[PDB]
Amino acid sequence: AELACFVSFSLTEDKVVWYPINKKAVQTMLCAKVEKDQRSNYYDTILYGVAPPPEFRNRFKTNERYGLDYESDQYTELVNLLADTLNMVSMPTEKFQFDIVKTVVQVRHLENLLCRIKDVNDILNANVKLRVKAVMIACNLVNETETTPLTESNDIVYQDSYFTITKLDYSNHKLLPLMADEYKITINTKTDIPDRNQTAFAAYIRYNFNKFAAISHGKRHWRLVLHSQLMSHAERLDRKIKSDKYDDGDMAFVHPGWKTCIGQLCGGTTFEVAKTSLYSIKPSKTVRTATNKIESDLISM
Amino acid sequence: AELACFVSFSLTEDKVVWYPINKKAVQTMLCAKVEKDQRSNYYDTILYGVAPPPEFRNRFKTNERYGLDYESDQYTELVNLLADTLNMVSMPTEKFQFDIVKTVVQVRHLENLLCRIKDVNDILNANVKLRVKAVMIACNLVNETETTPLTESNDIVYQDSYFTITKLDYSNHKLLPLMADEYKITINTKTDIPDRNQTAFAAYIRYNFNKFAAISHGKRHWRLVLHSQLMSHAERLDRKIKSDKYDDGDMAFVHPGWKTCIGQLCGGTTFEVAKTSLYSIKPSKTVRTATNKIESDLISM
Amino acid sequence: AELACFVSFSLTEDKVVWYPINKKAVQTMLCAKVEKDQRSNYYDTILYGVAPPPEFRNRFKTNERYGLDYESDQYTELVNLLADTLNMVSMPTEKFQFDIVKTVVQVRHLENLLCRIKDVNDILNANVKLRVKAVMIACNLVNETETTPLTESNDIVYQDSYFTITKLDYSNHKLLPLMADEYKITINTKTDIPDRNQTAFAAYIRYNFNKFAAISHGKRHWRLVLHSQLMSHAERLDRKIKSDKYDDGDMAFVHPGWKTCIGQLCGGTTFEVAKTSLYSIKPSKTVRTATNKIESDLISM
Amino acid sequence: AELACFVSFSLTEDKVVWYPINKKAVQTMLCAKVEKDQRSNYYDTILYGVAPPPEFRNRFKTNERYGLDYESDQYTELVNLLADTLNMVSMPTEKFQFDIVKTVVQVRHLENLLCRIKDVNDILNANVKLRVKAVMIACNLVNETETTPLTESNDIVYQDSYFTITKLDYSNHKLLPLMADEYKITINTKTDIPDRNQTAFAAYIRYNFNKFAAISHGKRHWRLVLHSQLMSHAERLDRKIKSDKYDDGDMAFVHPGWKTCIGQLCGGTTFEVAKTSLYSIKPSKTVRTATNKIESDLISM
Amino acid sequence: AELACFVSFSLTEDKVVWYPINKKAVQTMLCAKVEKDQRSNYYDTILYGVAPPPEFRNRFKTNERYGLDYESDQYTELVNLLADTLNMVSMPTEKFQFDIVKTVVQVRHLENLLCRIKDVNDILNANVKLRVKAVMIACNLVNETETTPLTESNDIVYQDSYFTITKLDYSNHKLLPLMADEYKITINTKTDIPDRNQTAFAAYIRYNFNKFAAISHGKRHWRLVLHSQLMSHAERLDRKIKSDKYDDGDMAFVHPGWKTCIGQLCGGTTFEVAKTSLYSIKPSKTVRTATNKIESDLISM
Amino acid sequence: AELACFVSFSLTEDKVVWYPINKKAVQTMLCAKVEKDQRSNYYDTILYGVAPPPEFRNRFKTNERYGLDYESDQYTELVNLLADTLNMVSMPTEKFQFDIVKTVVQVRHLENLLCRIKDVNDILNANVKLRVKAVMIACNLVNETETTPLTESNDIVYQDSYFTITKLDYSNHKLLPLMADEYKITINTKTDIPDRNQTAFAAYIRYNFNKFAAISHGKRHWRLVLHSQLMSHAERLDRKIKSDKYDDGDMAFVHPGWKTCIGQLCGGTTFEVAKTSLYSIKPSKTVRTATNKIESDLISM
């Protein structure tokens, strides 16, 4: 969804002031009758304040469409987290550009952050500055590495000196519910990670998550997805690339088929030709031996 | 626990008559003062009927002892299932042997049968003959092979035309809670299983249960156990091979290490020497190739 | 209360027929205006059946009087238990004596039998013959000895082969709540009890119920009472010895002081003179030695 | 458990600042992969702050082990009570020594203090200074007499001018649950207690708690334990003494067997030789007569 | 309401068969479009059976009309009581008169009978013959005198050997709620009532219901009404005396004013002239003296 | 109960400071062992602060005695209301006298005040000064007229220019529960009340509360009690008077028997001679005519 689906703004003062948008205004908007040449503008509900411009009605859920469950208590949380965060970022009006509210944000990412921000023990619960960093990242408003302290989810399922694996369960998200077994791999810091540890981690990943492939969409973090899903994620990373008119990190645990397939795409190869490599490359034997090692060590010891 | 921890009997009739043992009875005999010369006899509680021989109090849970949670509503259930069942078998008084009462029963297995039985959708809900057979097997009172219709669990996680995988989750049992992470493979029919299917299944579990090894305690059914447990089950089967004073079914999917290690024990080799082939033997390549193929076909389809 | 506070009767049939008395009936006769010449007759409520003779209203609880909480769901229970029971006895009309209706009943004892009876694990739940006997005893309509199968309470706190100790807790009764801290000792069989066991038990209660004294109101069952109550029970038994116009069972465990004090009263000595031997007589040394031995064996075993 | 299982610290400022440790950090720690030469150090969860060093993982409960129910709301209470208390004690960094966090504290003691501290009527609920004294005592961080105002439990079951008996019920403790009938005897103040009162108290104790023995582990307070437990407590006071490479108070109520047994231990005697005295010494006749006095006075009066 | 608002009938059998009318039926005929020529016929709902003649819709409650709350669970009750009842009367088809269906029923009276009937302690709970009589009286289908066993209410507030006072509380009815503060006096038997008792009772109600006046609508039962209502009931009885195109029972306790006022109306005097003797006539002095005596005896006893 | 049962005090500062007493301290006190010559002193619980002196244990409820339900949340309310109120009254230490805590207060009165003080709409809910006046009156600590603004209860059931009738229902008091139909008559102010209004009120009272007698215990307020209770209240006003080693107000509505009876008592007459007048005096005919007037006016109008 576009940032405009969650917040509206004012340029009266010297610093752009943002405001939350409530479930009633969105409701009134969706039913109201608006002239076409006026659908790009935030709609005034009169009784409930400003609402997203009609142009984006397609992002909200109806009795027939799939979209943001704007009626969810979660929507109110997200809407406030955003307004707060943006006002705090305090951007100068003189440089404000309307097309910013058209920035597409990562709604499921943000929702998980709420759970982290709301969690008493989670560092983000008290680190106002980190929270702002996590949120700007999630809003695709800034280019920064999603290192562990900032990762969207905190359900930790693995952690060593260098990496951290979090479970991304959307099943219960009350905003954009979704079923998909997914895990996220983030680096604890930007320190160089010796092949020693990379290899080990790669062997761990292959044993404990053998049905998943660790891939990267370019940034400095990786997702674990079911083999039955590479094909799709690949397609998606195809349209994206065909819209830039890429740094996996060389990490030893990155799925070889993906690594090669994407390689080809970034070089002009058509998807219908490169999709083949996803299942065509065999894992390195350095990792397969490292994998069998973990197994027999568990059996024998 | 011994069958005598759940049922008492009468021999006045033509066939043996079994009776349920209640929690008050048990509570009473655990506090009663019984002379040594009587510890092995069923105990008369006077107010609550017959309790189990004091010789078995070890078996029950105490404020500081792990045992049957006979205070549980699940104990009443099992207790009645056993009586009802035994009564049907209608074993002849004349041929009755008090020793039967000392038969160690598979408590957690029975606890699962209880769930299958109270399940209206399960065949054991209405089919009595099968119910009696499933329970007798669970009680170690019959040699019959545990085919699929008689397995201890409903939780079907996989089923092709020959095999069925069911989840053994003891973590939530009210009688004897347990954490072990296991599944059970049972054939649907005592019919000869084609090699093509044996191998397909072998490949199926390699990819879907890579952390496990399918073993056999000698019968024609299998348990998927964690590699970090393979030893234990190996030792148990050994101590069992000790008291002498094994039909692997020779199924393609049985863990190779186990296959031979248990072969070495049956020939006379000491555990100290055979425990090695458990983690030192590799699966066939026909199987590896078959499992990589699953991953591949799963990546593109 | 008199049996007539719970049941009315009919003599039209061959055997006497008893009927339950309900709370509305009672409520009605307590407010009705009855001429003196009628106070001793069962009262016809017209709308709610037959209420108890107004001559007994004392017996019921009022906004400012302690009595049977006939408004209780427990009154209905007892009322029906008594009717059902009496009906079974099938006493012959011709030999019926209205006086039976004036028999003082052991209300708290019956209240406990109710608990034993609704207990599915208790023998009185299904065994009717025993139930009738237990209730008749509780109603003072039979001479029978209160053996263990017939005691008023389930709460078994101790049981060796000859005796059984049950807890008498009136504190939670709905009919006639009471705080007295008592237990009851009953023999399991009218068989001769060896001296070795008598003494063992004597030592057993000295260490396990040191604050109590096992007494007897003459029958073959005993009540463990607080030393700070020994007098009271001593006086009661005295006032009872007055209305003349006692089988201690001579059990080794009966409180010595009581043993003789009650001996002195039966010979003719005035309470003023015998009430002394209650706290002035020591237990045997065979018993003291036996009780110190319990403590000792308990310290090291 | 070692203090490190509940709090972490910082030496940045001039006074050591302590911080609570939450159930998530402990959780992440228990699963995380840590290099051996790093298990002595507090572990950084990144998302949940600092956790106890892996070296002490053995103190936390798992799905298979018995330990601190760190997931309990009680753990959060204890963790905060500790941090607060320690920061308040305000210790100078210049003198800080790491090995302090290795101090083993009395977890059940502390838990009872929470109930006292949380109790509106309990003086500790408002006496910040006493609370700090109770807590330092419980943490084995200071040597001070556990006089009544500071005793771990406030369930008072006896009290006269000089002594106070509190019930220690662990049955419901949500941290380290435990079944054990125990009572504690603490002096109201350090005043000398005339033999007159000691004798009396000794007689009271022997009557109202005859199944218990009043013992002391050296300090100036006493525990009441079941005779069936002396043997154990003795063993424990043996290892302790055999680790000092003792002032009961001479109190008249101290169990003679214990007094003598411990005497011997402090003199080199082996436990297997001294354990004998626990059940070998008879109570003084001054106390046995004082005891029989209470009894007959209750009967007669 | 007319009997036809609760039951429909069939004449195919030997005796008339009655059927219950349900709320959906009613809901349906209230919304259905019926031609004038049909309003007086039972309405066929097709989906929910037979509804009442539309000629009576006035009688039911609407979002803005006071009527039978047929949506109530109490309507189902009454509806079935009436059918069951009528069926027992087994009135002969040949002699059936559709007019019976137009009989105005005593809805609030029946609502009370329902309570008496579902009361297990009430005689109408099991005694069917009496039940049928009580209901027929309530339905104005029989001349029988409303003696005590048949009164509409259980709530017994007084009862001597001849009379019974029951509380008529409509305030909580689900059918036709009402506030009127009334009680009902009914004789327990049609036997001659001695003057001594008549007068005692007269004095009894003067002191216990001084705000009321016991009146009679002609039958042999009485209603205690508020003096501030005496007129109303006086007018009603008058309008009744109009449609001509009264057995006071001559009971000593009947309100004198009423006694004569109703006498004057039966002779031919206009209400305008008789309504006076209602508040202008004094009670006997034998009664005043008798009532002061109650107060007195009540002050000292 | 004596004020000491609710609050303790300190004379350290210049103004007496009072403190509440909690249910735990009272509990500890009731069980603690205190020397006789020390029962007049407030008892120190050490763990729960100061408690009432043992001398007054008889005022607290046990498992066998009737008294202050000190365990009730109401006790905590009363205890605080008192402490606050007394500290606010701020009495000088120099004039403090111990025997003040021995002042017997009106517990039920105070409890009703709590309900008034806790009531949002009740003026006392915000009028700190009135509350203090109501409370001092209730505590028998000051001599002031209980005019309406201060009357213990606010359940108003009648009110005209001069008087106010409140219902005193103790049935639900959670401190000293009590069943007794009682009403209170208080004057709205000290203005003289013309015979005109007195007469009227007297006639109203006799009609709407005919079973009650309006009496006075001397002060300037009156209670309405059942005739069946005059006798008692009289006895009580007898002992009181026989302990003074009286101004009803001449109010027309005061019960004549009471007026005369008390008259005699204040003149030496023995109670056993004066109790006679309670039922011997007839009401004035001025009030009986005024009474019949209200009745026929209600009938006629």
XYZ file of C-alpha atoms in Angstrom, chain F residues 1 6 66-82 105-119 122 124 131 134-139 146 150-155 167-179 184:
64
model
C -17.257 -2.017 68.805
C -10.545 0.170 63.976
C -20.601 -13.225 65.765
C -18.758 -9.958 65.366
C -17.066 -7.553 62.988
C -16.383 -9.324 59.715
C -12.908 -7.772 59.864
C -11.981 -9.763 56.769
C -14.557 -7.815 54.742
C -13.486 -5.187 52.196
C -15.871 -2.983 54.112
C -13.679 -3.194 57.225
C -10.811 -1.700 55.167
C -13.068 1.117 54.042
C -14.327 1.889 57.530
C -10.850 1.721 58.961
C -9.579 4.281 56.521
C -12.631 6.545 56.722
C -12.021 6.638 60.450
C -19.097 3.497 67.957
C -22.145 2.715 65.832
C -20.756 0.283 63.330
C -23.871 -0.216 61.224
C -24.408 3.534 61.154
C -20.850 4.078 59.891
C -21.228 1.370 57.265
C -24.261 3.107 55.770
C -22.283 6.361 55.759
C -19.640 4.620 53.631
C -22.325 3.885 51.040
C -23.318 7.523 51.166
C -19.706 8.715 51.051
C -18.974 6.375 48.162
C -22.075 7.494 46.269
C -24.518 11.978 47.549
C -21.219 13.716 51.394
C -18.632 13.865 56.103
C -21.660 12.628 59.963
C -18.751 10.458 61.089
C -18.133 12.140 64.415
C -21.846 11.779 65.135
C -21.733 8.099 64.228
C -18.663 7.575 66.380
C -28.461 13.966 63.069
C -25.978 13.836 58.032
C -28.275 10.820 58.438
C -26.592 7.431 58.188
C -28.636 6.299 55.192
C -29.675 7.980 51.970
C -32.223 5.523 50.609
C -34.685 3.078 54.936
C -32.131 1.366 57.151
C -31.442 -1.994 55.565
C -28.766 -3.976 57.333
C -29.595 -7.192 55.516
C -26.680 -6.616 53.163
C -24.206 -4.853 55.448
C -20.971 -6.812 55.036
C -19.688 -5.844 58.529
C -22.365 -6.622 61.135
C -25.159 -8.131 59.010
C -28.623 -7.846 60.530
C -32.264 -8.433 59.626
C -35.285 6.657 60.099
